[PDB]
Write a protein that binds this ligand. Structure first.
Ligand SMILES: Nc1ncnc2c1ncn2[C@@H]1O[C@H](COP(=O)(O)O)[C@@H](OP(=O)(O)O)[C@H]1O
Ligand SMILES: CC(C)NC[C@@H]1CCc2cc(CO)c([N+](=O)[O-])cc2N1
Ligand SMILES: [Ca+2]
Ligand SMILES: [Ca+2]
Ligand SMILES: [Ca+2]
Length: 246
């Protein structure tokens, strides 16, 4: 199995629902950050090595392709960070693969990112995220990898991640750049809420007859998951409160 769909959309743009939609369409796994967090934490250090290679002035792209092939063996599609930041390298590796860009209102995106992924350094909620992550075995190596992959997506060496203007500017620029670099015939821009119609047409499949388009991974659910992880101290003992999570 090889990559058929490359998801270029940023975190908090509907990537987990798209992951679930592609798994329905193809009956084969799709990569997502939640594969790392909940299934393959050993992938963190491999992604870090790939991201480190992007920091060099002249990255060895073939070293990156090699690592990507290893990470993505067995998967038919990618979404979310860290893979989205590698969409150009994936397009070269898989020239027949189609590219998705999931997108949403930038201000809704920023809030979602701040509540789930990248709280500001002085937000007390950041401590709750850290505590709940500790329950999952997630440590500082994960945060470094996630942040470095977002900076690679935004093509920045340093950025003050607490600066909302920079994040909004980079979101807009990233989404613009995808449309500048990917030929339109190979790109579907999927707006949050769009559903099956445009995706199935783009992928040359019928709409799945009696299956609703997924609506997964809301910030409310992620906040509740963090709170329950902290209180109950176990994923397995609370997972049933979050049906369809992983
Ligand atoms: N079918 C759908 N329709 C509307 N919003 C959806 C959706 N599927 C996911 N979302 C929203 O997409 C965001 C998650 O994206 P990702 O999976 O990339 O992290 C969440 O936004 P909120 O945080 O505003 O709730 C989620 O509610
Ligand atoms: C489970 C919860 C208590 N903490 C883990 C959360 C899960 C959601 C999440 C999603 C992304 C992008 O999908 C990233 N990310 O890009 O770093 C980090 C996190 N962190
Ligand atoms: Ca480089
Ligand atoms: Ca500016
Ligand atoms: Ca629709």
């Amino acid at each position: 199995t090889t990559i058929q769909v490359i998801g270029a959309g940023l975190p908090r743009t509907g990537t987990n629902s798209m992951k679930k939609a592609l798994e329905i369409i193809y009956s084969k796994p799709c990569y997502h950050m939640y594969e790392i967090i909940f299934k393959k934490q050993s992938d963190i250090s491999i992604w870090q090595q790939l991201i480190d290679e992007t920091h060099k002035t002249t990255s060895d792209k073939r070293k990156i392709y090699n690592g990507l092939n290893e990470l993505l063996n067995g998967y038919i599609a990618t979404t979310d960070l860290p893979s989205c930041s590698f969409y150009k390298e994936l397009m070269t590796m898989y020239p027949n693969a189609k590219v998705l860009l999931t997108i949403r209102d930038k201000y809704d995106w920023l809030y979602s990112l701040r509540k789930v992924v990248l709280p500001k350094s002085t937000d007390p909620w950041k401590l709750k995220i850290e505590e709940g992550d500790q329950v999952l075995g997630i440590d500082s190596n994960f945060y470094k990898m996630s942040e470095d992959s977002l900076k690679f997506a935004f093509q920045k060496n340093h950025i003050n991640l607490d600066d909302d203007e920079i994040l909004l500017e980079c979101y807009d620029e990233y989404n613009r750049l995808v449309q500048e670099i990917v030929p339109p015939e190979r790109l579907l821009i999927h707006h949050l809420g769009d559903g099956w119609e445009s995706l199935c047409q783009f992928l040359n499949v019928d709409i799945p007859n009696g299956i609703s388009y997924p609506c997964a991974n809301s910030h409310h659910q992620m906040t509740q998951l963090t709170e329950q992880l902290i209180k109950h101290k176990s994923l397995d003992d609370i997972i049933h409160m979050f049906p369809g999570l992983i």
